[PDB]
Enzyme design. Structure first.
Site, PDB file in Angstrom:
ATOM      1  N   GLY A   1      22.994  15.044  34.480  1.00  0.00           N
ATOM      2  CA  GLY A   1      23.001  14.259  35.702  1.00  0.00           C
ATOM      3  C   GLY A   1      24.000  14.828  36.688  1.00  0.00           C
ATOM      4  O   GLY A   1      25.039  15.329  36.271  1.00  0.00           O
ATOM      5  N   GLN A   2      23.711  14.779  37.981  1.00  0.00           N
ATOM      6  CA  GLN A   2      24.652  15.312  38.953  1.00  0.00           C
ATOM      7  C   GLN A   2      26.051  14.917  38.558  1.00  0.00           C
ATOM      8  O   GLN A   2      26.912  15.775  38.369  1.00  0.00           O
ATOM      9  CB  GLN A   2      24.397  14.775  40.355  1.00  0.00           C
ATOM     10  CG  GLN A   2      25.507  15.143  41.316  1.00  0.00           C
ATOM     11  CD  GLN A   2      25.261  14.660  42.716  1.00  0.00           C
ATOM     12  OE1 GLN A   2      25.318  13.458  42.989  1.00  0.00           O
ATOM     13  NE2 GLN A   2      24.980  15.588  43.622  1.00  0.00           N
ATOM     14  N   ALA A   3      26.283  13.618  38.428  1.00  0.00           N
ATOM     15  CA  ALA A   3      27.606  13.125  38.067  1.00  0.00           C
ATOM     16  C   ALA A   3      28.161  13.813  36.830  1.00  0.00           C
ATOM     17  O   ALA A   3      29.199  14.459  36.891  1.00  0.00           O
ATOM     18  CB  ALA A   3      27.547  11.649  37.854  1.00  0.00           C
TER      19      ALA A   3
ATOM     20  N   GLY B   1      19.125   8.792  37.340  1.00  0.00           N
ATOM     21  CA  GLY B   1      17.769   9.126  36.955  1.00  0.00           C
ATOM     22  C   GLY B   1      17.833  10.203  35.888  1.00  0.00           C
ATOM     23  O   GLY B   1      17.361  10.020  34.769  1.00  0.00           O
TER      24      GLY B   1
ATOM     25  N   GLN C   1      29.392  16.907  37.842  1.00  0.00           N
ATOM     26  CA  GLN C   1      30.561  16.932  38.723  1.00  0.00           C
ATOM     27  C   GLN C   1      31.783  16.725  37.835  1.00  0.00           C
ATOM     28  O   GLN C   1      32.782  17.444  37.920  1.00  0.00           O
ATOM     29  CB  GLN C   1      30.480  15.802  39.751  1.00  0.00           C
ATOM     30  CG  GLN C   1      29.121  15.665  40.447  1.00  0.00           C
ATOM     31  CD  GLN C   1      29.137  14.699  41.624  1.00  0.00           C
ATOM     32  OE1 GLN C   1      29.830  14.929  42.612  1.00  0.00           O
ATOM     33  NE2 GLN C   1      28.370  13.621  41.525  1.00  0.00           N
TER      34      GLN C   1
ATOM     35  N   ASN D   1      33.797   3.874  36.619  1.00  0.00           N
ATOM     36  CA  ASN D   1      34.083   4.464  37.923  1.00  0.00           C
ATOM     37  C   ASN D   1      34.986   3.611  38.814  1.00  0.00           C
ATOM     38  O   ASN D   1      35.967   4.117  39.346  1.00  0.00           O
ATOM     39  CB  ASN D   1      32.781   4.777  38.647  1.00  0.00           C
ATOM     40  CG  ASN D   1      33.006   5.608  39.877  1.00  0.00           C
ATOM     41  OD1 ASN D   1      34.108   6.081  40.102  1.00  0.00           O
ATOM     42  ND2 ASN D   1      31.963   5.798  40.683  1.00  0.00           N
TER      43      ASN D   1
ATOM     44  N   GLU E   1      36.629  12.394  12.623  1.00  0.00           N
ATOM     45  CA  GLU E   1      37.740  11.448  12.553  1.00  0.00           C
ATOM     46  C   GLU E   1      37.481  10.246  13.440  1.00  0.00           C
ATOM     47  O   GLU E   1      37.540   9.101  12.992  1.00  0.00           O
ATOM     48  CB  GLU E   1      39.037  12.107  13.005  1.00  0.00           C
ATOM     49  CG  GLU E   1      39.499  13.254  12.163  1.00  0.00           C
ATOM     50  CD  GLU E   1      40.757  12.930  11.394  1.00  0.00           C
ATOM     51  OE1 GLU E   1      41.649  12.273  11.976  1.00  0.00           O
ATOM     52  OE2 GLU E   1      40.860  13.343  10.215  1.00  0.00           O
TER      53      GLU E   1
END
Lengths: 309, 412, 426
Positions: free
Chosen positions: B9-11, B117, B14, B179, B227
């Site tokens: 995803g873009q995020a 998406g 990023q 976020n 762990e």
């Protein structure tokens, strides 16, 4: 099976009479009857009853709008090779002739305006479409009425027809005349002709009358097929022999879901029996307070029919 | 030994570029050094392109950068089913081509953004296809679940109630970083009303460095990926702990930096410092993995924690005597040369499972209903190879996640 | 990705000249020249609107449909007029009568095949097609009739690619034609059932927004057009640029249409300040949302304040904080919870390009799907009935091979369309 209800607006005569409008359709599928009632002490109160239908049409709704929701979805069925039936049911003066035949308070007028015509219009357009064109179908129309167990050909000057049934029990109306139509204009001519010829009493001061059952049919035929490719029977019922037919009709339609005979059900029988067959019932309601008894009768009948759904 | 990573995803990309930055930064491997160990997926080219145009351009192989020129679509369905499907094979191929080249790996650190998406949908089946191809490993997915009030997409919940139900039966441990609740930290614990996405990324980009990076790195109390899930999940639900960092002080304003352990550890449990709007409103912790790094004396910890274990107002679950996995690393943190992060000589990236999310999930589930209750943007998924099933049947799914996170706690 | 503009009618055409006047400069394409682009980014995505032939001649991939020569012969005889390959000009020297029926059934129906022909030559150009842009006015022949046909055919040929429609719905106060509601009601009908994104502009909503939001005293058509073309550039072309969070026709479509009608929007530009003075630069961002979300400034006639929204798409295009953007949008969603519909937790669809309108620092196109536009189709629909009832200038339709049931159809349809839209305002 789809069942709808359509409320007609109060007419000028009723309005002048100052008849009260008992019916409301607050939603697309909700119809409410504000039944006036009096207790023994004669206290006045309203028993508001609610009915739900696949589609409920208000007094504002035009024939085109009604047609769109009821009959229109059936046309494809005939091209599919099925058998479709649309019935207008209700009390005398409820608007059945107006809806099927054409706009007229007399129930007799502009053919183009009614469901028979609109349905025909769609039949020609669909036949022309690519999926259908290969079919090489011919369109035929017939119009006849059933009166006291007798069938009369509206297309052939009220000619009395005989109806026979085989051991197989398939019914045929011999002598029924089928007319070839290749244009909506053609169908309109036949509708006008049949409607003029329709049964009735003496010239009433106003309005037509529904002593009989009116049935206009659109048939599609390649060279037989299942005895024809597909058939759509539009029926203008008599105001709710009549009782037996209506009782018979209900059982046949309900039988449709799962799978005391009358002429109407006999002629129509092939339309109920097949697997690929659909029906729509439109219940017409006159909004006047005076007609409240009639309306509940109509609505309850409708409920049982839809029940099969 | 290793742990691949799939930034989806873009995020997730990023954040990926960010976490990936902090890395070399504390490993002395400039722009062009070795070779990463992850991949990048997105159905919108322009974003992965940013990794192809911007910084850290040549530190990747155009092979670990997957793109579907096609369309992203802020809708699960399309990204999972319809479109997202076409790419998956190819995607997998890398996480099977990159998974082979190595030497006895441990798992894949997945990076996605719940309510997107390409981030919700796609992964859903990526993690999906992993749980079957390598059931014998760790599947820790690092998510950025929906801001409690400051969401973006109009549908967000549709996309997040769907990435949860499909991934739930496939992840090992799902880390969560909110976020919005991170912005607070940027407002309240660093002071700046100018927080670019590029910052939140530097942050998770930090908390994450404390997970893999340094941990997979020698120390006085090493903690393997396994762990985690072991010491961190009490139950098969791909349980989602929360990430928290301690020295989140500003490298300009205040300066008390020298904040001995005894302090930085207490600064983890105060709700205003946890990268998640799941304030311990009642949620009883049930296991915390205190990963420390820098100059820390084990007694300092095996004391600073003792003090905590007896604060009671920090109520830990019943069925859990001791739920404190003390992870000690050597090398102190490593702050961006000149971002806005203080730069202390010790930090505490404590993550944990808290009966708290009983909330966060709740509040996010409710959202969903409201819209589903009217089908809202439903026609957008149906027309994308989904059904009244997947929604209604993924709703019921989380329902038992509201009961689960309720039963495993609040009761004795 | 790609798209192929469509200049139906004169208006839709006149505007073509302005939409391309702009867009080109927003892509450094001189008349017949090439890419003089001040930058290098205004080229990696051009394809969306042009084609490679020579090497300096990127020709706009649009269609110019019209039954009145003089028009296209004014657009082709002026400024950028000499950039369209002649093949693009699908004229109909016939009598471009102002009848919807004359450009949809009798006169236009002929010129159609010679259009579809090209709309295919352009579609089968290359790469992958996204959709087609359609400009026109719903108050004339070549516009509402013939252009409304062009789509009914397009949507049968590629029910996959999208269809944005830019309609100049008949302005209220004064109608620049007489049968207007006839040509209109009939075209909206075709719209509600083919294109899946319509941006309705009002010549008088513009004047206003152009005479009070731009102290502009002599707002020539060129202007109005220019303003409009400004919005359609922010929409499409724009998003075909990079961005922290970029979208594209579909996103826009798949985030803005809750129910299949197609629904019509109302575009709004951001920095809309008068030249000299006003150049306040109050464009930090709260200033853009301040703008975009006010009543005036909505190219539509109706006022949002008169009906909830279903969706909104602030397609910004200029470097800004995904925080001060994502944030603002919120307060906005809470200060006006009243009108913003509830069954959609986040009506707003924040979009964010990077490069802004050539000479500006920060802008943001607004594409609103408000229920307010109910109060416009109402208008139109009213005008119809009031005149249909008497069959006013109906002989010009029927006499052209039309139907008395055709008009009935449209009104109802489009009339029902009003109904539905209210189903959400409540």
């Amino acid at each position: 099976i789809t069942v709808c209800v359509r409320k007609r607006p109060i007419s000028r005569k009723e309005v002048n009479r100052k008849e009260i409008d008992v019916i409301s359709v607050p939603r697309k599928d909700m119809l409410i009857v504000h039944e006036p009632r009096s207790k023994v002490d004669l206290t006045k109160f309203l028993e508001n009853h609610k009915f739900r239908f696949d589609y409920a049409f208000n007094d504002t709704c035009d024939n085109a709008m009604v047609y769109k929701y009821t009959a229109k979805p059936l046309v494809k069925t005939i091209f599919e090779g099925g058998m479709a039936t649309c019935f207008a049911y209700g009390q005398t003066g409820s608007g059945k002739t107006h809806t099927m035949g054409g706009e007229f308070n007399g129930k007799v007028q502009d053919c183009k305006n009614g469901i028979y015509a609109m349905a025909a219009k769609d039949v020609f357009v669909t036949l022309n479409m690519p999926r259908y064109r290969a079919m090489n179908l011919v369109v035929s129309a017939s119009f006849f009425e059933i009166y006291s167990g007798k069938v009369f050909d509206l297309l052939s000057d009220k000619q009395k027809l005989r109806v026979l049934e085989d051991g197989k029990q398939q019914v045929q109306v011999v002598g029924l005349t089928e007319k070839v139509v290749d244009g909506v204009e053609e169908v309109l001519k036949l509708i006008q002709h049949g409607n003029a010829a329709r049964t009735s009493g003496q010239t009433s001061a106003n309005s037509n009358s529904s002593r009989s059952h009116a049935v206009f049919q659109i048939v599609l035929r390649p060279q037989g097929s299942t005895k024809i490719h597909g058939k759509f029977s539009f029926i203008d019922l008599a105001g709710n022999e009549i009782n037996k037919s209506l009782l018979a009709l209900k059982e046949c339609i309900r039988a449709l879901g799962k799978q005391r005979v009358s002429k109407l059900t006999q002629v129509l029988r092939d339309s109920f029996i097949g697997e690929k067959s659909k029906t729509c019932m439109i219940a017409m309601i006159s909004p006047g307070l005076s007609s409240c008894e009639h309306t509940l009768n109509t609505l309850r009948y409708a409920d049982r029919v839809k029940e099969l759904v | 030994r290793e742990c691949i990573s799939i930034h989806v995803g873009q995020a997730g990309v990023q954040i990926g570029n960010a976490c990936w930055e902090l890395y070399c930064l504390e490993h002395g491997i400039q722009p062009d050094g070795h070779v990463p160990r992850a991949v990048f997926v997105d159905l919108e080219p322009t974003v992965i392109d940013e990794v192809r145009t911007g910084t850290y351009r040549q530190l990747f192989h155009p092979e670990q950068l997957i793109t579907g020129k096609e369309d992203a679509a802020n809708n699960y369905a399309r990204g999972h089913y319809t479109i997202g499907k076409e790419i998956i094979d190819l995607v997998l191929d890398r996480i099977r081509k990159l998974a082979d080249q190595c030497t006895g790996l441990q798992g894949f650190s997945v990076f996605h953004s719940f309510g997107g998406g390409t981030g919700s949908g796609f992964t859903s089946l990526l993690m999906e296809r992993l749980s079957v191809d390598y059931g014998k490993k760790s599947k820790l997915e690092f998510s950025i679940y929906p801001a409690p009030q400051v969401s973006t997409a109009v549908v967000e919940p549709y996309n997040s109630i769907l990435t949860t139900h499909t991934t739930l039966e496939h992840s090992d441990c799902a880390f969560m970083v909110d976020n919005e609740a991170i912005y607070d930290i940027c407002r309240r614990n660093l002071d700046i009303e100018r927080p670019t996405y590029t910052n939140l990324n530097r942050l998770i980009g930090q908390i994450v460095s404390s997970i893999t990076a340094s941990l997979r790195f020698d120390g006085a109390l090493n903690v393997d990926l396994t762990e985690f899930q072991t010491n961190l999940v009490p139950y098969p639900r791909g349980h989602f702990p929360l990430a928290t960092y301690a020295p989140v002080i500003s490298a300009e304003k205040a300066y008390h930096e020298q904040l001995s352990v005894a302090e930085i550890t207490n600064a983890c449990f105060e709700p205003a410092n946890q990268m998640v709007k799941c304030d311990p409103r009642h949620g009883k912790y049930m296991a915390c993995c205190l990963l420390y790094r820098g100059d820390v004396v084990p007694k300092d910890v095996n004391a600073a924690i003792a003090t905590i274990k007896t604060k009671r107002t920090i109520q830990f679950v019943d069925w859990c005597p001791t739920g404190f996995k003390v992870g000690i690393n050597y090398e102190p943190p490593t702050v961006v040369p000149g971002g806005d992060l203080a730069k202390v000589q010790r930090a505490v990236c404590m993550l944990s499972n808290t009966t708290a999310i009983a909330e966060a999930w709740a509040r996010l589930d409710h959202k969903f209903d409201l819209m589903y209750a009217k089908r809202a943007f439903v026609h957008w998924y149906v027309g994308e190879g989904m059904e009244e099933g997947e929604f209604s049947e993924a709703r019921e799914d989380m329902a038992a996640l509201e009961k689960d996170y309720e039963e495993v706690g609040v009761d004795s | 990705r790609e798209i192929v503009h469509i200049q139906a009618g004169q208006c839709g055409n006149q505007i073509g000249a302005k939409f391309w006047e702009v867009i080109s400069d927003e892509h450094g394409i001189d008349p017949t020249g090439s890419y003089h682009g001040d930058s290098d980014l205004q080229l990696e995505r051009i394809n969306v609107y042009y084609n490679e032939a020579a090497g300096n001649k990127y020709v706009p991939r649009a269609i110019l449909v019209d039954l009145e020569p003089g028009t296209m012969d004014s657009v082709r005889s002026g400024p950028f007029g000499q950039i369209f390959r002649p093949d693009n000009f699908v004229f109909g020297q016939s009598g471009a009568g102002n009848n919807w029926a004359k450009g949809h059934y009798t006169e236009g129906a002929e010129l159609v095949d010679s259009v579809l022909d090209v709309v295919r030559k352009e579609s089968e150009s290359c790469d992958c097609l996204q959709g087609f842009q359609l400009t026109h006015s719903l108050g004339g022949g070549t516009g509402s009739g013939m252009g409304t046909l062009l789509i009914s055919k397009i949507r049968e040929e590629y029910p996959d690619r999208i269809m944005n429609t830019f309609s100049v719905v008949p302005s209220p106060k004064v109608s620049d034609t007489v049968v207007e509601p006839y040509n209109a009601t009939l075209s909206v009908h075709q719209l509600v059932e083919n294109t899946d994104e319509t941006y309705c502009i009002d010549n008088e909503a513009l004047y206003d927004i152009c005479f009070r939001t731009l102290k502009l005293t002599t707002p020539t058509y060129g202007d109005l057009n220019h303003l409009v073309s400004a919005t359609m550039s922010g929409v499409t072309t724009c998003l075909r640029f990079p961005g922290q969070l970029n979208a594209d026709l579909r996103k826009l479509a798949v985030n803005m249409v809750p129910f299949p009608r197609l629904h019509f929007f109302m575009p709004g530009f951001a920095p809309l300040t008068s030249r000299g003075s006003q150049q306040y630069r109050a464009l930090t961002v709260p200033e853009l949302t301040q703008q975009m979300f006010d009543a005036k400034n909505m190219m539509a006639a109706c006022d949002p304040r008169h009906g909830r929204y279903l969706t909104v798409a602030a397609v910004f295009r200029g470097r800004m904080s995904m925080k001060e953007v994502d944030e603002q949008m919120l307060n906005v969603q809470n200060k006006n919870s009243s009108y913003f519909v509830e069954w959609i937790p986040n009506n707003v669809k924040t979009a964010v390009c990077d490069i802004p309108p050539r000479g500006l620092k920060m802008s943001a196109t607004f594409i609103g799907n408000s229920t307010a536009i109910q109060e416009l189709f109402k208008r139109i629909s009213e005008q119809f009935t009031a005149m249909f009832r008497r069959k006013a200038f109906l002989h010009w339709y029927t006499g052209e091979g039309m139907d008395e049931m055709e008009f009935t159809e449209a009104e109802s349809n489009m009339n029902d369309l009003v109904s539905e839209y209210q189903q959400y305002q409540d």
